[PDB]
Every structure is written in C-alpha cells, then in structure tokens.
Subunit: 202 residues, 6 copies
C-alpha cells in the first residue's frame, strides 16, 4: 500500500544547505529524508517516526500534487537511524526498494552574463550569484534526491555558493555558483554519488 | 467533446463544511450544492454559463481552472433550483450523470493520539480549524479530487462532533483531514467508504 | 538532449499583449523570440546561448515550471532577435521545425455574459476585466507557450478587443478575450488559421 | 500598564458575519463572542492566556499583533462562558469595561446604483461576497477599528437580506462595505449610528 | 468632510511609467490622480467620476492604512478634466486646496556596486538596474505626487530606466537608473516641477 | 539630514538568530552591523557608503518600510564590519551615540502555555515553534531594530531556549522566546540589562 520512492540518511549537514517548514536544522546535525506514494501516506509515516523517537524534530512535511515528503533531523545519528527503522517496520518496506536516482540534465554555464544573473536572482531567494561567476545546473528525479546532491557538493567544494535547491515536485533542481573548477569538482562528485546510490528501476 | 469527471448533488450542507468553502459567494448551512469537475479544463467556462442562464437564482461559490481540470460549485436554498441547473449542463453538453468517473480510493488511515510535534506542523500547512495533541486523525485520499466534497459533508452528518481540519478538493487527488475521538473518526471513515462505493460511474 | 517544444518568432508586438508580458518589459512594436523546452532546467543553457551571442537583446521571461522551461527574449531589432534564436538552435542541435505542432484543446464563445459569471471571472484575474453583457472567447491549446502568438495575432486583427488573461505556462495554454460578438468571432477564426499554419512534429 | 481600546460582548452572531471571520477556529451562527483591542500591541498575548485558562471551553477565532495594536476574538456556544472569560481579562489587567475608547465615526455614505466598472474593481480588492452592478452600497468608517465587528453584526440582524462585502476590523480604522436595496442599506446605516452612540467609553 | 490631499492632471503618459489594479493605461493617454482623507471617502469620489463620464476607466482604487487613492484615465484630455470637475463639485472642494508637495529626501549614488544592485533588484520587480549604472532616489509626501515626478523625469530623459515607483503610503518613493547625467537632468527637473505645484501647507 | 535611530555592532552571532536573518545569509560566529534610519529612502545612500568603503562585507537586509529604512551588513572579520560602520557615520555626519535610546514597551512571561494558545500562536509564525506546556517570554521595544540585539544576547546566555519569532521592522520590535521558566527568566533579565546599557538620545 505505501510505496517508498526515496529513503536516505544524509549524514553531517553542511552549513549552507541547512537553510511546508517546521523546526530548522543546524550545521553538524543528521537527517532522514523520505518521499512516498500515495502522497497522503506521509502522515502515517511521520507518526511512526515521532512516536518511536521523541528526540527527533520534523523540518519538512508536505503533501504535493503527486507525492508526500518528509524530513526529520537530530544531533544523534543513532536517533535518526532508529526513526528510519520504525518507518520501514511499520510500512513493511525495505531501504533498497526505493527508486534509483535518474539523471535528467546537467550543464556548466561559464561566465554568466549580467542580464542573466540579475533575472536569475529574483525568483530565487536566499543566496545570490554575481555576474562573472560560473553556474552549474543539475536536474534529477525523484526530486528529493536533490537534497543529498546539494549536501555532498558543498562538502567537497566549501567555497561554492548554494543559489537554490528544489527538492519537492516531479523533478529536483540544483543551482550552484562559484569558479569554473569549484563547479566542475562539484559536478563530477555529484554524478559519482548518485550512481552509487542503490534502488530499483522506474 | 466536454467530458464530465465528477457530477454530483450534495444535499443539505452541514455547518463546518459549508464554512470551509477561487472563491465566490459563500454557501450556508442547510442549503444545497451542485459540484462539477470536467475535461478539458477550460470547458468549465461553458458549463457555468449554462447553469447561470437556466436558473438565475443559483449562485457560484467556486470556479477554477487547474493544471489539468476545471471545477465549479453552484448552490441555492432551493434543491429544485440546483437540480434544474444541473440538467441544463447535461443537456447543453450532451452528457449524462453516469458518464462521470466512479470514485477511486487511493489511501486512508487513522492515526490515534497525535503527537504534539505532528499537530503543530500539521496546523501550519492547513488554514481552517485545528487539530489538538491527543486527538485521533483520519486521512482519506481519493480521485477525482472533487469527490472529497461529498466525503467531508457525509462525515460531518454522521459524526457532528468531529473537526474538519482541511479539505483539498482541487487537483489530481482529493485529500480529507478529520480530527476527533477514535470512535468519531472511525464512524466517519466507515460511512465514507460506503458512500463512495454506492456512487455510479465509468471506469478509470 | 534538449528537446524544443515551442520555437517562434513573434514579430510586431501589440500593446495589450506587450504590457501583459518576469524580467524586463517589452514595448509595443518590438519583437520577441519564444522558446519552451524539455527538460525544464535546460532553459538556463538556452538563455545563455542567446544573451552572449546577441548581447543587445533583453530577457523578459525566465521560468522553470513543474515539467517545462520557458524563455522570452526581445529587442527593437528583428534581426537581433532572429540571430539570437539561431544561436539557440545551433547550440542545442535543433532546427525550428523540430518543435511540437500546436494542438487545439477547446474553444468557445459565450455571448451576453451574465453578471455573476463576470464578477467571479474577474477575481481569478489580474489586468483587464470583462464587463457584464460583453461576449467572451476562451481558447485552450498545447504546448502552452503557443498561447503567446494566439493572443498577439488576435489583437492584431481586432484591436478593439479586451485581453482579459493569457496563461502561457503549464501543461496547457489558456486565452481569455472579451469584446462584441463580432470582434471575438473574427479573433477566434484568425487564431485557428495561424495555429494550423505552424509546422512541427507529433503528437 | 495594559490599556483597553475596545472591550465588547457581541451577542448572537448572524450567519453572514459569522462566516466572514490571523484566523483560528471559525465561529458559527447563534454563538457568542468577546472582542478585545489593546495597547501596547504585544500585551494581547497576556490577555488571551488570561481568558483561555479561566474558561477552557472558549475558542480563539482571531489573534493578531498589528503595526500599533493587538487584537483577540474568543467565542462559545455559552454566553456565560464568554462573559466569565471577559471578566478574567479585566481583573488580571486591573481594567474596567468603561476604560475602553468610545467609537468615533470617521465617514459614512450611501452610493446608489453602483456602476459596473466600480463594482468590478471593487470586487477584486475584496475577497468574500460580491456586490453586483445596480445595487446600492453603504460604506462606514470608524475608530478604533475593532468596532467594525459589532457594526457589521448589528446591520445583518436588522436587515437580513443585505450582502456583507467586506469588514476590515484590524488597523488604525475600521471599514464596513454593505450591499443591498437602498432601503436595506439605509435601515442598516441608521441602526449602526444608534448602536455606536449608545456605547460607553473614554474620550480620544 | 472630504479632504483632498492630492488632485492632479498628468497629461501625456510616457511608456515606462504606464506599468489594487484595474484597467491598465497606455502610452499617450491622460490621467487624473486623487488622494483623500478619510480613506473610505474615495468610494464616493470614484462613483462621482464614473457616472459623470462613462468613457473613463479606473486604473487604481485602494484604501490604505490612512488615505484613499484613485487613478482614472482616458484617451481624451477633455474627458479626464470633466471627471475631475465632477469630483470637485460633488465634494465642495477646490483644486488648489490640495497639499503642496513636500520634499523628504533625494540623492544620486554613482556607480552602484554589484552587491548593492543584486539585492536591490529582488524586492523591486518590473525593471532592473545593472551594476555600474548610476542611481537616483527621491522621496516626497503626499505619496501620490511620486506619480507626476516619475512621468516628468522620463519625459526629459527618455533613455533612463524606471526601476520602481511607490505612490501609495505615508511617503512616495522613486528609483531611477541611467548614466550620471541622465539622472542629474531628471533630478533637477523634478525639483522644479514640484516647487511649481500649487497647494496649501501641511 | 540623515537621522540615525539605531546604530549597533552586534558581535558573535548565535546560530538560531543567525539563521533567522532579504539578501545574503549570515552564519554562526560572524559579525553584523545594524542600522535604522530616517527618512526611509536615505538607507540607499547608507548602504552605498558601507559597501564601497569595505567591499568584503555582504548585505543581509535592505528594506524601505512605511516610515523607516533598515540595513544589516555582515562579515567574518569584526574589523571589516566596524570600518564599514565608520564610513556610514562619516558620510552622514553622525556618531554612534546620536541614535535613539532603547525604550521598553511591554514584557511578560506566560508559564505553562495552553494548547489552544500554542497552535494559533504557531500559525502566525514561521520558523521554530512553541509546544504546549513550555513557558513564553514576549518582549516589545522601540525603535524596532533593537530587537536584533535583544534576540542575539538572549540566546547567548541561555542557548537552550527556542527562538520563535523576531520582528525587527516597523514602528515597534517584538520578540517571542520559548523554553523552561528558568531559561526565559534568565533571558528576560539579561535583555533588560543590555538595553539599559545602550547610550543614545531622547525620547
């Protein structure tokens, strides 16, 4: 009855990525991210986690057009694992029955024009990209996988700028600004991470 | 040409659900409604004109064109008025009531004794009444989405102490959130399942 | 890799549609290039291709939707817009007729609109408004970005009409036009002709 | 320390105004309400606790901190419950009912036979019921803003066929928009003026 | 009973400025702008104009925290004057009983930094300023006077960029981008226009 | 000409308040300069003064409100922030103590918050949430931008508390803090001390 699309431990949160919403996560804490179908089943999923481990906090809970999304976090890695396990047990699913990440698009725009940069910035928010910087774009599905890609990219290239991360919808989208080599190091690494993630076929 | 996804008379509106209702005139307790969902979405503009010009005494409460589908709610104090407006729509589009889709249940569950953290984040993604920690929560998902309308109204009739937390009747799927004692939410769920099964329509 | 769904030169913008058009605003008499692509995020490469090939053009729309990506660029010079488009075609390995052919989803003319219909209609809108008693033309098509040319062409052949609403983003495009029964009938007929004449692939 | 700007029992809610009502639980027709406006704005957080802990059976419908002032609405099916919660607020802040400001009328007028262009642009800056071309429109402005609440409810009692188009009860001034026949809107305006004059309070 | 704060014919609208809302004005048309107190009296003001001259259209109608605001427009200058006259007659006011414009602030920031430019752009909308351009800011009250200043500024320096115009509130605000001399020509001219406008004292 | 209402070095940002802070986001441990001025539009000159004097700082808040203008800038270097502030002072002909003295408008501690209060309270909010049974400290002051230092200082002396809401823009500032009755009492006392110690003019 409950199909799990994404089930992932994101360990050791980087500080930029830490920024529908509930309690906000902080740098160094750990997260469990779950995407499911049908969307409304996510309400049973969150009760399963919160009643097993009172010490974890909900950061995202949203019922989208098709899918249901959840993020929970804690300072203790042991606590998040245990919440993940209660979800798997209460729904009769396994971790490797999730969908495998499917890459939809990626590219590097070097030396973004100023007119491109200014319009980019106003239906993003949070961080911004400045004219002259290089831009990496990356699209995947299921959408919630954008989360782990963002965190890993920042990990290996800490000088980069997280411009935007869309984790909810039909597809996930990542925007990263920096020097041409920072964004190349990030792109190469993301591809590796996603290919190594185990799951079934769409 | 114009396909009817949902076509339903919702008779005798209960007071929580009436208040819960993109928006036009608000319906009131005891009044009657006609709900219609169609494809392609923009056809609903022909549907509302058909109704409003046949029976000038009905009032539009909802009119909206979504990503895929078109939605209309009309209501009146007179049950005969809503009925006749419904017939103008059917005749003017060459459709019949049983040309609609029969309800398909996607999910349902009863979460007892909701934790306080679940209740607090649940209450800020909803905007009407609120659920309190300790209450039991019923969630019910179906498609087409507009059937969520009749499910909410039937639940309140049969269990008037419940709390209508949210009713999502527009989109690819409808979602119902109901709070109360475990026996109130269990009585509502059983009735809803019966009501949706009794409805006549085509196959997805 | 980048699939082009809509690629169109829309030349000589009429003033109602021009203002209707987010980034820099176009003006009456200027020319625009409209592009809808799949997958959505590919549109960022598409706009980069245009702006550095022909710097004199300005972006008016840039948006990443649920499934698709949308771009509008414009300039006073028809040549600058055309040349920017060519850059987009070469850098994605496409040509203009590799786009999707326009598919008509629904159209209708509501004469003598009732007042209850008009007031609730005007509240899901924005800009111009329709008055009780006017006639309403509604027109739906896909891909959505084709709604742009339908709107601009309608205003060209019947400038007295009222542009109520134009939805160019999504799974489907929607056009709302108000005027006399004759203005909108002339508008509806011309829109169908324009759309049939556009060459593209299948669906 | 805590100054009361508005303190009022609104008895027996009429159905249009009840539905019209930052938001918490929705009130229903026939229920009773207590409305309070205070200064400084943040003091209202002490006021709601005072009420909710004295009489657990009342429900908050409105709680909001504005640019200058703080606002609360609580309601119940029991008139005695709203009354007693009101008294807890007065006792716990060292205030009395007549410490409030007496209503000051800023403007009123009756626009007959509204033009269609006025009606169409008027309807998109309002979000509830709508006014139709040809109807007469009453506008009424007062301060403090929260008195708009009692003015709307009194008008509907005395002229039930009217249309409540908008009620702005939060801010520096309250505004009331009412539609109907010229005699319905004239009957409402006369009554409102009497009601506001009869209210006891201090001087601006 | 009805106090008129601003009463002004803005003749021959420039194309940039032509962009709460009703029907949109077009380049070359003419407008009447009215601000009043108490705010709600603006509903009597608009009925007076629309019933006298059916051929004019409402573009702005809004009841703000303190004041009421109206804009109407037409292709015929004769029509707008006539609507203005119906308002004056129906409320027993005179055109020169409005408030005189009071200048609150103005300044020219030359060569705006790129970090300043990018953040400026996201809680504006419509047009944008690019890094390196010069910026003129101008504040006045009553707020509705920002309207005539914007239109006049564009008239004498058509190459300029109208970044934003706030006409509703306690004070009006104008943002203009261009070369340092375009913005200086605009600023000098605005000052002249406002000083020449006749009204009473606050 | 430019009147300074608030001018403050807020050094060593705590992590709840840091995230709470629109433009570039500050991080825990960095330093910020906060400025509230009158008239509102003067703030555009104020920020220009800072960013080109010390380019290494980043703007986090820039807003023109009904009456007043607000600016926040930040950097990892306390010296860069201080030096940017000095540029703001020289270019406007002010000094730090020409600002307004903080005026306390209301404060209170609600113990054992009822559940109906908590759920409706959480719906006019944003970020962190208060749970039924916790104690609530509310604190109101003017000018509003002083709410920033009150929030950051409270978190410094009682890091276990929950920052529910901080309103720094307007006619008045408002602080919402949740925790145990002891955390918030310690927080309330320290806030009053900090505010009394700030030197400025009258009101």
């Amino acid at each position: 009855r409950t199909q799990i699309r994404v089930y992932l431990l994101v360990e050791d949160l980087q500080r930029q990525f830490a920024a529908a919403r509930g309690y906000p996560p902080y740098e160094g804490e750990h997260a469990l991210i779950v995407e499911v179908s049908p969307a409304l089943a996510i309400e049973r999923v969150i009760d399963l986690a919160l009643r097993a481990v009172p010490g974890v906090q909900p950061g995202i809970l949203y019922v989208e057009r098709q899918f249901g999304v959840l993020e929970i976090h804690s300072a203790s890695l042991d606590e998040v694992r245990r919440a993940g396990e209660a979800i798997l047990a209460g729904t009769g699913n396994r971790a490797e029955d999730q969908l495998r990440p499917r890459v939809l698009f990626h590219d590097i725009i070097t030396d973004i024009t100023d007119q491109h940069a200014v319009i980019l910035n106003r239906n993003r928010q949070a961080s911004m990209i400045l004219p002259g910087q290089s831009l990496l774009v990356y699209e995947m599905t299921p959408a919630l996988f954008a989360a782990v890609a963002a965190n890993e990219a920042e990990r290996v290239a800490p000088g980069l700028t997280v411009v935007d991360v869309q984790m909810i919808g039909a597809a996930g989208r990542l925007y990263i600004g920096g020097s041409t080599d920072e964004v190349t190091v990030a792109r190469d690494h993301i591809t590796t991470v996603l290919s190594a993630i185990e799951g079934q076929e769409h």
